[PDB]
Every structure is written in C-alpha cells, then in structure tokens.
Amino acid sequence: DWTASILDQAQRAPESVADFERLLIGNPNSSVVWMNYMAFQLQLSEIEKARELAERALKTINFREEAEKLNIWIAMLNLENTFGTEETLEEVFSRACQYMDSYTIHTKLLGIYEISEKFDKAAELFKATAKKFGGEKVSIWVSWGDFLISHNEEQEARTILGNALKALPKRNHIEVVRKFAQLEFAKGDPERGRSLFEGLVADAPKRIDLWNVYVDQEVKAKDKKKVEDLFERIITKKITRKQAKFFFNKWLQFEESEGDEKTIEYVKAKATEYVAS
C-alpha cells in the first residue's frame, strides 16, 4: 500500500526477493513492481536494499518512460523523508530536480512534507519554490495560499497573494486572485473570498465568466439571500441573450433546490420578461 500513495502523489502475489526478481525479468519498465519490491524491503526495515532497488530502477526502466521514472523519484523522496536524514533527502531531491522537471519535483516534496506533517519544512520549501518559480507558475502561489489558510494564517495568505501579484505577469493576476477567492470559500473566510471576487468584477466588469464563478461560490456556500442579491446584479450587466438564459436557468434551478415556490415563480416571471426586452 506504500506504493498506492506514491501513485497517488504522482498525479500468487510476490512475497520474496526471487518473486520480484522473477517479475522484473518480464516487466523491467514497471515502476509499480519496483516500488512493491522496495516496499517489501522497507517492511523488513532493509533500507539500504530498498535504496539500491531504486537505483536499479533508474538504470533499468527505459529512459523514455518518464512517468515510470517519476514514480521512482517520488518513491525515493518518500523513502528518504521517512527513513533517511536531512542530508540523504536533500541529495535525492537535488538529484531528482536534475533529471525530472524541477518544479514538479519541488511540488512533490511539498506534498510529502504536508503528508508527514512537517509543516515547518513545507513553509520553508514554499518560500524557496515561489522564489525560483513564482514569476512563472500561479499554482505555487495557490498551493502556498492553501497551506497558510489550512493552518489558520489568513493574514499571511493575504501577504502571499500580494507577493504573487508582484511576481506574476499581469495576464495571470485575475487567475491567481480568483483561485485565492475560491480557496477562502472552501477552507477559509468566505467574506474574504467575497471581497476578492468583488474586486475582480470591479476591475473586469465584462468578464462574465467571473460573475459565474462568483455565483457558483455563493451557491455552494448556500447563503440564499447573498445568492439572490448576486443573481439580480448579474442580469443588469453586459450579457448576451444566450448567457441570460443560462443565468436565469441556473437561478431557477437553484430555487428549485430551496423549496421556495414563490421566488421560483418570481424568476420565471422576471426571466420571461427579460426576453421581452
């Protein structure tokens, strides 16, 4: 099952050495066999042998199987994090960035630190990863904001969103703010998400997809009066007839999930007389 989690982070059963070496005869490119073989050795606390197996996998798996290679590198990161030392993990990490996509490897160690609840080490790696890649990747900011909101550091999250804006190209500013806003609804302060969305539609009033994401968040949170205020703001905006049907349909359909047939008629009435205009 140790390999089930490696496969997760990457996005007649064999019971002996001879069994695995026999499996590896016909399946040299299978990272799953190699990881199971590593887990077998790890369950017997045979750490050096597990490490040697990973080295073999790196040389034995066909060089074009980058996905199988990634699994091994993640398996080594996990192995070193759990059974090795700071220095032993650092070497594997630096080596893995050499051979695979460095940002991806950075992302995987972050996920590993979180899983093993080395929160302090996650926070330091976030800072370093955002310094190296933050000018290019919005995901590092979102993931770092996620971390901070999950550890009840709202104000630090605002600071990080500020630094994300200074570092990212202007063309990504709406996206990073939009994902911090969704993060606040999901894990943090919805009032803070509301404020972020307000600023987005304040600056890009014609970005009608933003009005949509915004009302999806308000619906998912189920404050029906804020959902209704938002729906009625939206239809007094620069939208096409095609889009107007969509928002009225979504409005109606939400009220059908609220059991208020007085307002569900209100929408039909007001929807149909919108088409009038």
Swiss-Prot record:
Give the subcellular location.
Nucleus, Nucleolus
Q: Where are the HAT repeats?
A: 12-43, 117-150, 188-220, 222-257
Q: Which domain of life is it from?
A: Eukaryota
The record describes its quaternary structure and partners as: Interacts with snoRNA U3. Interacts with MPP10. Component of the ribosomal small subunit (SSU) processome composed of at least 40 protein subunits and snoRNA U3.
Query: Other remarks on record?
Result: Present with 8860 molecules/cell in log phase SD medium.
What the protein does comes down to:
Involved in the biogenesis of rRNA. Required for the formation of 18S and 5.8S rRNA.
Protein name per UniProt: rRNA biogenesis protein RRP5
What organism is the protein native to? Saccharomyces cerevisiae (strain ATCC 204508 / S288c) (Baker's yeast)
